[PDB]
Design a protein around this nucleic acid. Structure first.
Ligand SMILES: Nc1ncnc2c1ncn2[C@@H]1O[C@H](COP(=O)(O)OP(=O)(O)OP(O)(O)=S)[C@@H](O)[C@H]1O
Ligand SMILES: Nc1ncnc2c1ncn2[C@@H]1O[C@H](COP(=O)(O)OP(=O)(O)O)[C@@H](O)[C@H]1O
Ligand SMILES: Nc1ncnc2c1ncn2[C@@H]1O[C@H](COP(=O)(O)OP(=O)(O)O)[C@@H](O)[C@H]1O
Ligand SMILES: [Mg+2]
Ligand SMILES: [Mg+2]
Ligand SMILES: [Mg+2]
Ligand SMILES: [Zn+2]
Lengths: 483, 310, 394, 104, 482, 104
DNA sequence: ATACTGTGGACCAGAACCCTGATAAATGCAACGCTCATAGCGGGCAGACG
């Protein structure tokens, strides 16, 4: 409900010239840096290491939600969705006439006069209805949720008493129905607008045709930018009716409404639309941007995307016995462990720290990752090996699989972390020592030798001169050690 | 369905599905398929059934029965898995758990029965009495329905009557006690009964879960076994000892009852095809008869041990 | 619909030593503790006496729904129902191979359409029958909802896969048509279990002959314990040939199939039974038991009396109020509670916060007029005068 | 009977609270198949899930319609409210109700 | 698309007062109609500096907007116009009240005054044209733009009719007749707003019944043309055999007028024409055989190839480009593409994308050879048969098509998108090579900024190579405090 | 029904005051169907649009509206105004309206 | 010690199949039609007086 008054910027492109709907959108001149600025990450310092193990457990449990590293396909999706959004308003020009007036005027001018040739090709919808098919667990929903939220939803105009809804989101559920999408569109329009359209239009008495007929009216009345149907994978074919008639219903949806529409699905749902996809026919449309997991190798060498993501994710570790450099063996092993699927790669790293905080030594080993793999990836054993096989049928059959209820399992991990008796020697060292900003030198030089002499030496220097900066403290503690 | 009967000890799943419709007064053959599965195009098969997993979801609240136990302990799949090959054995389960039916017989390229050969419904005169006295019910059993030998491994010969699986493709039939079971004078070939007794323990044996010797392994094992006690001349097949052993232990009428004529005059004989390097799947009959002829004091499981180890 | 896993007892009687069905129930209780278990009352507490009037009115009005007291006969009824629901499982044992014979025979009756067809002569059935005739308003339905509430309804086993249903209750259709009893038996096992037996057995147009065998085999698909039939008087109102048809089918089921059945009805339904089983007759309570006043009436009156919710009330009861109750109500168990609740409601609403005989008389004569004509016959006591009408003692 | 058994599912899907039936006058005598059969209908309307009901009719309905104990006790299950016209003279004193109503 | 009708006179005598002909755009000479079709991208002057991805999208958009007329298009346009405006003379809705005229003629014939009179005139057969050429020569892009001039749904207000001028049917891969019959209904109720498929195309009727209902449906609305594309899938498939394949297209005479058009690959000629009664119906109004252009005409270069390549050359988008095309590159195009028009633009697009990928940033013969040898593998037999020129060898391979080209384009776009950028401070990390460098880096971040930190670390190793980390630390800090 | 729903949408979009339907008599009863379903159509038409509607019809249309007009249930609407020809004798005396109109 | 012959492994090619689409015929099943019993009704017959 960000009801900002329309400030009309000027775009130098001739097609977007003097359109009240388009100009209210944010400008696009440095959007490449804006598109690459989606990156977000937690801020971690060395201070959080000496905290109690429950605080570290909470910090680790907070990593999945607030970590995002843009990749190659995100730029392409951002540019394509920008093109679809901004090219969708060349038809519904409010200041001049609509499309039908333009065609009628063109016919009247080509009849007599000297307008020799007029092309009646017009616009197919207004942009192609993209179909973003990809394997489940790859990260489509979060990508759209972030790259589609940088546009204000409602631009309340002043001279025209209309609402410029820029985007929208339908979402099906488990064992859905064909009429449920039509009802949910009306229901979800209320949350975006604050009205009560369900009371007057959401009656169950209406047939399937009347729902689309009213949707056309309301979509024409409010200047609509996009309509993102999501999670077609959840639908059940037999409950709604004929499976092959779903394609007819979706084509009818695309034709009647007229605004750009973008569906989402999994390779299981591909067979519904495969009839139109195989043909190169213009008018079928439904262009597909295939989502694929991260590939390890490129031109016989490791792909830069994989290492770039791996190092960035590996910088978030707060292990006590941690070494600075990632070993190559684990780099080799977890890719074959997880096949590069975007969701589970992060999940294995999340669960590894929780398991290592309780099993004993605080480090990362290949056996630990293997143990986590047999622990909490049981439902996804078939799909992973199907991806390893490479046969399209094996991948298609085992799609839509997801691990249930990981969040509840995280809570019992934390509860088990809470109840422990024995302590590590480093825990003893940090507890007995005055670790109030004096800890940092000890931590940075702990691994050089045994700390038995180190614990009183730093105290001796610090009591010798209580007022020091750590910057001057480091040369002195280094000098007294070698003696 | 709310009350799916649990399979008895050592019975086929076809009789279990039949008793799942005998127990609730469902007499229309269409409604049984409508309720058990939900599709009117599903077929009825004796041995190597498909659509399993739907039959296990009904028994899910009982924690014991699962897909693997159902296929290995309650089908005729144990006879084909060890001998054909390891990878085909491992992929048959994933091909069979789902709705695919045509590929099941094709991929296990031994089920080219064409016309239904001895797919008439069979039973045993003496076993039914024991089943009646200890249970109170009668059912089809895996011991009766050996693919080739029409003999109960313990005793006697099976009672053929006149019906077939192709008479009704979409009908599951349970054995009827009131349907008269009439005895006939037992005409038994003792060699066939001995072979059935020899081959019986392989059906229920835990070690047949994963042991499938490889094709090249089969070739080396057979060459070494032939050369151990002198069944092969210098780079030549003797052709005489192999014939005289099998003629000593087996007579010709047993072979014609098994439809496995030897052809010493003709160059193309299955016995010579076995000893030459293998390239296709072989039936259990040929391996069993070769094992019985070459060495008569070794069990099937330990025979597979010696075959697979070296 | 309370799915409960089963854990077995170890019974003492040798006849029940093997069954899981009869060893899954909670144990039968001695008559000493059974009387105390049935009783329930209201929480009361004196904190509500000084609260507002409206908040007190609903607490007063909640008396008839949450107040039950065990009388003399209910302790006999509980024992008889326990015996008659335990005696119907000794002939359907699944361990020793008896349910399989009782269930295999039922397929033959479905095939041929006759209920006398038998395949195994060794199959023997044990069952009992009862009828519970009582005057209307005597609270006989609530007795069969509180005695038969100790046993859980649906218990799920795990060695087998049977989902046993312990008790089921149906209501005969008002017209008494021979198809709707069979179509309503598939609508109690349809809700108490969460299934759709009705769609697979009722919509397909079958004859009554096959629909009768489908019931008798589906009831043995599970382990049905009790089929109690309420409101049996409507059976007399059906067409010709149906009055005897389901007075013979409901004795065929008890004798042959082996599912116990109990029938409950009004006194005017006794004629069809006698137009040709243990009989228990229920009568309205009376104070004049032999030569001295009955103790049950006094005890019940005191127990109900201690539930008053009036700020200024007489704690001790007077005998004149008891005589007024017995002369205005005649002891039928419905009138007393409603009369007392209405009297104290009017007392609260008027402003006079204490109950008197005059207020009872005024409320009875002003608010219960549709009920007076029948009570005149009960008050008079003349056998010929009381013989008219229906639903009266005969 | 199917309609009566089918009303319960809808009356439980939506938590129905009260169901008022008025103009019960018309059902005294008609082609209903029988007075006792229609009374059996109105008493077998107990199987509907809870949903207390209120019945409204002219004084011609009472005598004809409640003439049996098992149905009479269900009609006046919570008291039978009877109405009457206003009386001018209460006990020789003018009623304040009539005066106030007429003046207003 | 309900364009209202405004009439205009026509010079042709036969099209006198018939609304269907006179409600259409007026006649034009061939050169103007064959010259008004050309289109091209905008190519703004200063759009040579931008992000890589935007320019990549612009190059990927090239194949969809580049069209250039040639010689055959004018003849094709003339034939299409004659077919569309020559099948409307039989059906003139504007007829005077003919009852009186016919009855008066009958009376004068009967009374003996007259001698002859033509009562009712009935139509006979229909015109038909077939257009065949090797796949990839432009038999559908050159048909979606010639037919773009004619409006599809003209509405008559004085009458109540809708003039569905042209309708496009495309057979599927299966090649069964019922698919074509149902696809006709699909296309027709997609053109208008209706539900003809459920009203007529039920399972109850057989092939003959739908074939007879198409006539009623095509007379209720005034059709003008019916083009069938991709007829090569009806050659030898499960369509009941070649005999019934011939019989169906012969029996398609019963559809009233509606001159049909058939498009297919050169292999379909042998299967489709083997009987006299069917070939004369196939080539009923000519038979034009398309063929790819050639470099030379008669001992001298062909001008059309020169114009096509030269006009295509300016449209490229690169930082440094040679505007003056060198003849060697043109010879390379004629050696690789060999003439087929589909491959000519695809080679240019793929070469440009790979040039952006490698950073060579120039179009040369070597890049063209590399991309041709890398990507366009399956099309090789057709080109190698084109080199020889033997008719049977060229006829053997005239059905090959390159698959997965869109997926390859998208993956190439991802490849060029994943280039990213390296800041000098981030590049300083890559400057450190030995693992000990990176370790000392990681321990010594917090106290010192990287800009000063990296140099003193590097000289520490450049001065003293073989000396350990804990022993390295004092000298580094000695450099740092100063 | 789609026409009715879109009509309701348009009538809500524009401020619509009155909707007069003229000459109900001329509607053909053959291709339309049952008088009951025509009455149902009109009842649905009244409710859905939401603005007051005025109907004009012949006395034969009263036959169509027999069912909905007999009922006195609230919410049915359809108040009836009866046009009549000029009567002469009221209260036993000739009417003034006819005399004035005749003279004029 | 090399030409002659068996021979095992690798290899052409016709054939049973068998899968699928186009068309006619048997058929189960909601869709009215029918039957049965039940309550009020207007022309006809006995009646009856001036
Ligand atoms: N022994 C009792 N103790 C307490 N309250 C009782 C007792 N018997 C009956 N009641 C009350 O009386 C009412 C029971 O009447 P119902 O449940 O209608 O049974 P019923 O109407 O007598 O059965 P019918 O007439 O054969 S349908 C409830 O309000 C009970 O609280
Ligand atoms: N760059 C990223 N960093 C961390 N997690 C990511 C990233 N991209 C995607 N994810 C993961 O993807 C998950 C959501 O995507 P997903 O569930 O596959 O979409 P859908 O619900 O449509 O299948 C999130 O749990 C998130 O952890
Ligand atoms: N006149 C033309 N100029 C440039 N490119 C053309 C022309 N005609 C066709 N094309 C190219 O041909 C492609 C379409 O080929 P198409 O006509 O589908 O081949 P076919 O006719 O074999 O199906 C388009 O991508 C387009 O770029
Ligand atoms: Mg999702
Ligand atoms: Mg009751
Ligand atoms: Mg083409
Ligand atoms: Zn036996």
């Amino acid at each position: 409900a960000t009801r900002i008054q329309a400030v009309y910027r000027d775009t130098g492109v001739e097609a977007y010239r003097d359109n009240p709907f388009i100009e209210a959108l944010p400008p696009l001149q440095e959007s490449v840096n804006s598109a690459a600025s989606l990156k977000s990450s937690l801020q971690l310092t060395s201070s959080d290491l000496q905290k109690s193990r429950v605080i570290r457990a909470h910090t680790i449990c907070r990593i999945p939600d607030d970590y995002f590293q843009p990749l190659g396909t995100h730029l392409l999706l951002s540019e394509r969705i920008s093109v679809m959004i901004r090219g969708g308003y060349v038809g519904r020009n409010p200041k001049t006439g609509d499309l039908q007036k333009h065609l009628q005027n063109g016919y009247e001018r080509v009849q007599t006069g000297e307008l020799e040739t007029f092309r009646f090709e017009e616009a197919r919808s207004t942009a192609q209805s993209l179909l973003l098919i990809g394997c489940s667990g790859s990260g489509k929903t979060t990508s759209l949720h972030r790259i589609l939220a940088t546009y204000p939803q409602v631009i309340y105009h002043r001279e025209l008493n209309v609402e410029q809804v820029v985007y929208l989101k339908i979402d099906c559920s488990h064992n859905g129905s064909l009429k449920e999408i039509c009802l949910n569109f009306f229901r979800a329009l209320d949350r975006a607008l604050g009205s009560n359209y369900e009371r007057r239009y959401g009656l169950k008495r209406h047939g399937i045709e009347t729902m689309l007929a009213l949707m056309s009216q309301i979509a024409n009345a409010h200047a609509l930018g996009l309509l993102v149907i999501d999670e077609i994978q959840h639908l059940s074919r037999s409950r709604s009716g004929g499976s092959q008639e779903m394609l007819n219903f979706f084509v009818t949806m695309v034709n009647i409404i007229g605004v750009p529409v973008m569906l989402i699905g999994t390779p299981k749902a591909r067979e519904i639309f495969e009839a139109d996809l195989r043909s190169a026919r213009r008018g079928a449309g439904f262009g597909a941007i295939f989502w694929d997991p991260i590939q390890q190798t490129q031109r016989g060498k490791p792909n830069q995307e994989w290492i770039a993501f791996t190092d960035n994710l590996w910088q978030l570790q707060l292990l006590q016995r941690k070494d600075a450099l990632l070993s190559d063996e684990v780099r080799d092993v977890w890719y074959e462990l997880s096949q590069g699927v975007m969701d589970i790669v992060v999940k294995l790293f999340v669960l590894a720290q929780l398991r290592a905080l309780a099993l004993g030594n605080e480090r990362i080993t290949a056996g630990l990752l293997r143990q986590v793999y047999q622990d909490e990836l049981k439902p996804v054993h078939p799909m992973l090996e199907a991806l390893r096989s490479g046969i399209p049928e094996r991948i298609a059959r085992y799609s839509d699989l997801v691990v249930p209820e990981i969040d509840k399992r995280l809570i019992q991990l934390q509860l088990d972390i809470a109840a422990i008796q024995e302590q590590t020697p480093e825990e003893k060292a940090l507890q007995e020592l005055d670790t109030e900003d004096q800890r940092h030198l000890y931590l940075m030089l702990k691994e050089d030798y045994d700390s038995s002499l180190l614990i009183p030496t730093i105290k001796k220097a610090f009591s010798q001169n209580p007022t020091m900066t750590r910057q001057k403290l480091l040369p002195l503690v280094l000098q007294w050690l070698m003696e | 369905m709310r009350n799916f009967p649990v399979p008895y000890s050592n019975e086929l799943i076809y009789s279990t599905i039949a008793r799942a419709g005998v127990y609730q007064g469902i007499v229309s053959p269409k409604q049984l398929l409508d309720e058990v599965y939900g599709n009117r195009k599903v077929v009825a098969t004796l041995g190597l059934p498909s659509h399993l997993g739907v039959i296990a979801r009904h028994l899910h609240q009982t924690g014991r029965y699962a897909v693997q136990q159902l296929i290995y302990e309650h089908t005729l799949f144990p006879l084909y898995a060890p001998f054909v090959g390891k990878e085909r054995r491992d992929e048959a389960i994933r091909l069979m758990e789902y709705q695919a039916q045509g590929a099941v017989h094709l991929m296990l390229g031994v089920a080219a029965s064409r016309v239904k050969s001895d797919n008439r419904f069979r039973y045993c005169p003496d076993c039914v009495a024991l089943q009646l006295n200890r249970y109170g019910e009668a059912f089809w059993q895996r011991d009766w329905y050996l693919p080739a030998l029409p003999y109960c491994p313990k005793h006697g010969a099976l009672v053929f009557f006149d019906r077939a699986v192709d008479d009704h493709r979409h009908q599951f039939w349970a054995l009827g006690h009131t349907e008269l079971l009439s005895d006939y004078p037992k005409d038994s070939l003792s060699q066939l009964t001995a072979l059935a007794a020899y081959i019986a323990p392989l059906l229920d044996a835990p070690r047949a879960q994963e042991l499938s010797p490889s094709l090249e392994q089969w070739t080396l094992f057979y060459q070494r076994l032939a050369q151990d006690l002198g069944l092969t001349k210098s780079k030549h097949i003797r052709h005489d000892l192999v014939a005289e052993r099998v003629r000593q232990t087996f007579s010709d009428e047993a072979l014609e009852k098994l439809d496995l004529k030897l052809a010493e005059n003709k160059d193309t004989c299955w016995l010579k095809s076995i000893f030459r390097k293998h390239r296709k799947a072989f039936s259990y009959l040929q391996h069993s008869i070769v094992w019985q002829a070459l060495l008569p004091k070794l069990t099937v499981i330990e025979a597979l041990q010696q075959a697979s180890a070296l």
